[PDB]
Write a protein that binds this ligand. Structure first.
Ligand code: FAD
Ligand code: SF4
Lengths: 117, 117
């Protein structure tokens, strides 16, 4: 990289075998995408309006609390992507525990490979 | 505070806290003095006809969010004044009090000798 622009990706020939494929060689261009979001947006009157981080945090926490209060236990599902790091997934599990739900899942994992049973 | 006067508004609690701070500070110097109200000259003969030569200027109304988006969010229902609104509202005061209060010598002796006004 050079500053805030990722220019290329090369294999690591010292710590591993030093091979890559197309998704690893050329797949980091989405970091340079101009279509990436920058600020959180809240839907009011059918239009997305930009908000601050504090307003977004308060909105999501209060809306999850409203769902729990109206409908009780296990009314919230947490669907994650398996591309996040272990600490992100741990905090997502903690967030699922805090809003009183046991439905934590992912469309990509979809229940495991069945070797655990 | 509310521990003594019972449930009231918040500025009552603030007033009690400040008065108690003054009393405690006097006590810590070795001479406890209780808090007493001051005596002022007041006018009760002012009627609407005595102010009939004053021009009329409408109040700066408060910008309140629509009730469609208020019922779902914990967002603020009103906005703080802008500088133009604040200047426009503050320039409307009638200046009821005496301008000489902080240098008048009559009220000084009236309050020193505890004369009823
Ligand atoms: C629902 C509600 C809405 C209100 N709305 C308004 C309003 O719109 N406008 C307005 O002017 N006023 C309003 N008030 C009134 C205002 O909130 C109170 O009158 C004011 O805050 C009084 O404050 P206080 O210092 O007397 O005590 P509080 O602020 O009530 O409490 C002081 C603190 O003492 C602590 N405390 C209590 N017991 C102990 C203990 N044993 N040891 C240690 N700490 C302790 C508590 O944790 C608390 O934080 C409202 C009150 C309520 C209940
Ligand atoms: S001096 Fe006080 S009471 Fe008189 S017009 Fe101004 S704000 Fe109102």
């Amino acid at each position: 990289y050079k500053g805030d622009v990722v220019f290329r990706v090369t294999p690591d020939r010292v710590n591993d075998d030093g091979w890559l494929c197309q998704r690893g060689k050329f797949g980091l261009g989405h970091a340079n995408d101009k279509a990436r979001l920058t600020a959180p947006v809240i839907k009011r009157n059918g239009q997305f309006v930009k908000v601050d981080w504090n307003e977004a945090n308060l909105e999501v926490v209060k809306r999850l609390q409203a769902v729990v209060a109206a409908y009780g236990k296990d009314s919230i599902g947490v669907v994650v992507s398996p591309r996040l790091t272990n600490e992100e997934l741990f905090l997502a599990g903690k967030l699922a525990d805090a809003v009183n739900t046991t439905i934590k899942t992912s469309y990509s994992v979809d229940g495991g490979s069945g070797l655990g049973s | 505070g509310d521990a003594v006067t019972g449930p009231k508004i918040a500025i009552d609690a603030i007033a009690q806290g400040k008065n108690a701070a003054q009393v405690i500070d006097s006590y810590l110097n070795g001479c406890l003095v209780p808090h007493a109200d001051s005596q002022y000259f007041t006018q009760k003969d002012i009627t609407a006809a005595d102010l009939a030569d004053r021009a009329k200027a409408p109040r700066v109304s408060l910008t309140v969010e629509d009730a469609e988006v208020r019922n779902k969010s914990f967002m603020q229902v009103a906005k703080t004044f802008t500088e133009e609104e604040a200047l426009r509202e503050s320039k409307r005061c009638l200046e009821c009090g005496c301008r000489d209060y902080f240098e008048c010598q009559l009220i000084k002796y009236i309050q020193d000798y505890d004369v009823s006004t």
